[PDB]
Design a protein around this ligand. Sequence first.
Ligand SMILES: Brc1ccnc2ncccc12
Length: 293
Amino acid sequence: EFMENFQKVEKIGEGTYGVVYKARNKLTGEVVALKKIRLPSTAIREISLLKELNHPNIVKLLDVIHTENKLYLVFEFLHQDLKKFMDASALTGIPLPLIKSYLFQLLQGLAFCHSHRVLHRDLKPQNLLINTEGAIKLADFGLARAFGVPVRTYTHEVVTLWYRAPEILLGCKYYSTAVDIWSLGCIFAEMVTRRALFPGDSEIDQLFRIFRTLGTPDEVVWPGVTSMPDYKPSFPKWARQDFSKVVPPLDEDGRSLLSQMLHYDPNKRISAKAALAHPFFQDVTKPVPHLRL
Ligand SMILES: Brc1ccnc2ncccc12
């Protein structure tokens, strides 16, 4: 009966966890994103707590509905995701000032959630949503704690590894907020170069692409790494590349920030809060993007 206290309902696409619909609420007339999650009470409690986790760079969670043994998440509707926008921007690139504005807003969103001890764990361009007024917002915060992150979606589509922090790939049991900083660093590099930084197609391909760029990690740069569940002494030993080669034509400030976002040691990785104070953002602005809706 649920899709009846919506005036109507059409299909935006296929989420990690279920189908995503565009729908209108009949009481309010508001246009929302409705996500079906297919199948647990602990998840219900934790996801309901995210209704309070409100920030202008976090996609608003309007309602959590458990009915007929199905879960529906009701979110703020935004017209476009950063994946589509980057694909639309492929011939020209996103202008640097807009890249800087989006990174700045995304760090404010991360700083807010992290301050409340909530992490994302699965940041990717597809869950960064943009509006006509130059805002960017993080979608699906705190869901990964609730439902985990599967190898495959409900439609068996492969869940992307491209943004996964090395601690996760090496089998670390405990996530820290540093996993989100790693993901956002990967997205920053992709906005600048118009190519994914580490487009792995398996867990080992993902790790070896990271190794070939940043060097094979060792006890020098990452104390304890040789004791991680999935670390092998037999890993090939690649040398580190200069960031000047990895993200041209990013300036010294941006390369400095990106380097701190991609430190192997999660402890050494820059926080969201300290990243907001980085000299890269001294001249930050809020440009209006060119959106075709
Ligand atoms: Br609008 C929209 C589109 C796609 N995925 C989304 N995920 C969360 C909230 C809004 C979304």
